[PDB]
Amino acid sequence: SGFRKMAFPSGKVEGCMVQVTCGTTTLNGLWLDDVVYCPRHVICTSEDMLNPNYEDLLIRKSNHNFLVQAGNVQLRVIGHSMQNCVLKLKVDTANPKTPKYKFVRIQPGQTFSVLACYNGSPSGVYQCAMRPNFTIKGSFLNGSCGSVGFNIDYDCVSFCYMHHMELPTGVHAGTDLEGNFYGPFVDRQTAQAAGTDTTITVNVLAWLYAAVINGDRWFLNRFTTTLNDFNLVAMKYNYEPLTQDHVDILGPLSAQTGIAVLDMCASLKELLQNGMNGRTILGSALLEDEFTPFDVVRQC
Amino acid sequence: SGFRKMAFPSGKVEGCMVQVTCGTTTLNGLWLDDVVYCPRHVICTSEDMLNPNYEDLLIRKSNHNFLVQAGNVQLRVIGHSMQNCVLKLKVDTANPKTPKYKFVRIQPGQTFSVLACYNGSPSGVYQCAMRPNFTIKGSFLNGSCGSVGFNIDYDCVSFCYMHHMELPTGVHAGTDLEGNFYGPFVDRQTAQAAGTDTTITVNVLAWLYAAVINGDRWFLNRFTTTLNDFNLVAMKYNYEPLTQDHVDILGPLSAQTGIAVLDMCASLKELLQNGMNGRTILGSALLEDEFTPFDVVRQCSGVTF
Numbered sequence A: 001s002g003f004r005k006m007a008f009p010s011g012k013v014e015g016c017m018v019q020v021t022c023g024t025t026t027l028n029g030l031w032l033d034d035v036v037y038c039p040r041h042v043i044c045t046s047e048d049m050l051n052p053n054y055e056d057l058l059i060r061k062s063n064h065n066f067l068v069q070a071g072n073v074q075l076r077v078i079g080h081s082m083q084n085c086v087l088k089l090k091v092d093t094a095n096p097k098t099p100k101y102k103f104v105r106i107q108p109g110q111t112f113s114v115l116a117c118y119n120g121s122p123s124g125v126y127q128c129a130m131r132p133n134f135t136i137k138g139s140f141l142n143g144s145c146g147s148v149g150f151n152i153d154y155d156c157v158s159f160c161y162m163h164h165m166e167l168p169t170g171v172h173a174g175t176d177l178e179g180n181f182y183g184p185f186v187d188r189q190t191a192q193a194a195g196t197d198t199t200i201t202v203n204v205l206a207w208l209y210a211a212v213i214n215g216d217r218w219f220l221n222r223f224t225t226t227l228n229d230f231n232l233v234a235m236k237y238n239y240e241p242l243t244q245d246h247v248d249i250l251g252p253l254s255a256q257t258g259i260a261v262l263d264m265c266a267s268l269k270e271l272l273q274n275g276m277n278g279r280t281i282l283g284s285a286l287l288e289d290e291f292t293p294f295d296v297v298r299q300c
Numbered sequence B: 001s002g003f004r005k006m007a008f009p010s011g012k013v014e015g016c017m018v019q020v021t022c023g024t025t026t027l028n029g030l031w032l033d034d035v036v037y038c039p040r041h042v043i044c045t046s047e048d049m050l051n052p053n054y055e056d057l058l059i060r061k062s063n064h065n066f067l068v069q070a071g072n073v074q075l076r077v078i079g080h081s082m083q084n085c086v087l088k089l090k091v092d093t094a095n096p097k098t099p100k101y102k103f104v105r106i107q108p109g110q111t112f113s114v115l116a117c118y119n120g121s122p123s124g125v126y127q128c129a130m131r132p133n134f135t136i137k138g139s140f141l142n143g144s145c146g147s148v149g150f151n152i153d154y155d156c157v158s159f160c161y162m163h164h165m166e167l168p169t170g171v172h173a174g175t176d177l178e179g180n181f182y183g184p185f186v187d188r189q190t191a192q193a194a195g196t197d198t199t200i201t202v203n204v205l206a207w208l209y210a211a212v213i214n215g216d217r218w219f220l221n222r223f224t225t226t227l228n229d230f231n232l233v234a235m236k237y238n239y240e241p242l243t244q245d246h247v248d249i250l251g252p253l254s255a256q257t258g259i260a261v262l263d264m265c266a267s268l269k270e271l272l273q274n275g276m277n278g279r280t281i282l283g284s285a286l287l288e289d290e291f292t293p294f295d296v297v298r299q300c301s302g303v304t305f
């Protein structure tokens, strides 16, 4: 038993992390087969930060303007191209530590592990969610750009996030590994701000199911709710709408615990109305929204 | 910026995990140089576990009774000894992935990363503190026994924990890598309970410093205090006594923020007495006590391994 924010073992990702330098700018790159992936803003100077013309700055670069270092080894760049906001440096060596991997773009509510890196050296691993507003609440200092987010279901590393920037509210924005930003963000230092964030309702319900599996029943009630009445209440607390897809996804946890999805919704409505009255659920005094139904089943 | 419960990168330890089977029991082993370390209770049947004589149960066994699998490779066990509650299985082959490592015994209040494993396969990594009552609040299922806890200092992995059992309340108990239990526990199926736990004061103060560094500042106040005054409130709220050693260890964080420890203790004095007045600190409604001063400095300064 027990229930923790658990990350994937980071070793398969550790063996892919390198340091990329261009001019006076150093950040992290991801070395898979014979390609190093990094944020394209590595090629920006101090004036290029507001309105970088990336096609223009990249055509002015030669393979030898990029210093790529895998621990102590210098890797030789032999090609470079841009895909959206990601730079792809071709190198003369395939990474012998390349794992089975794929690139996947995730939806809001999805969780993943982040391997925070500085100078191509891993610092730490933690769990994140893609917030409904397409940001992540990370822990990222200067030098962390090019750090990645991943899942490892079944020996295959699914890359879903590369870190590009910190927004003024202290939250983080980045791309999939095809270089397309999550949300409306751009790799320019023009004024940008995240939308008002919301709570990931389906994940809160999954975590209440976790709590019941782990033996805590205090917050259940004898009530039920319609899906529509639930959404009308939950949205007044800045909760995301719960769709029939969400209700379908919780079916297995419903079945394991014998609590119907809309009975659990009634429990959530009451918890939003009452708070916890000094109690905790799975060590938390807040309603936790960064565990998915799939994470709850994996850990339980 | 931002602040997260962050494990060490687990790759150096993933390379050490193996599967150990003795009769019907499968669990995890740690493969370092030419030895596999696992809990000695792997040798016990259900019947044995009620009142085991490990001396006797062990002499009865032989190398061929232990199956060690490093992925899809069989290791040859050529020797077996016991050190306290840990079984040492000598194998014919040195782990070519053995990192630079020490065995270390940690103090209550100190944190470490757990690599949760099943059938010798790494499954997940999370950060824990050794509670004052010598339990950890882990996440462990059947087959997690032999999972290890570790810290990394530069290139050197310090192994501090091996998982042995779950207590009735859902908390976890284990040994250092020399087989000495953390806390007043024994490796037999009998009646055992975690002592009443306390809050790790110096870690809460460390976390309040992390909050300030991230611009959560509401709980600050004009007041200050003393050890004796603060300690008398701590004891009342089931908080560990704060010592002069703790104050000196927070010194860096007191510096970098301009809140001196007893200044911050005055903030914490007020939070225990009055609550959080319906606010949060770094997205928690609780006073978080599983971050050490070192954890806060390392995370808020980008230390790398």
Ligand SMILES: CCOc1cccc(C(=N)N)c1
Binding pocket: A244, A248
């Ligand atoms: C037009 C939609 O009608 C149905 C019927 C049965 C199931 C569902 C569902 N996704 N749970 C939807």
Ligand SMILES: [Cl-]
Binding pocket: A105, A106, A107, A110
């Ligand atoms: Cl997804």
Ligand SMILES: [Cl-]
Binding pocket: B052, B053, B054, B055
């Ligand atoms: Cl004995």
Ligand code: NA
Binding pocket: B220, B221, B222, B223, B224, B262, B263, B264, B266, B267
């Ligand atoms: Na103060």
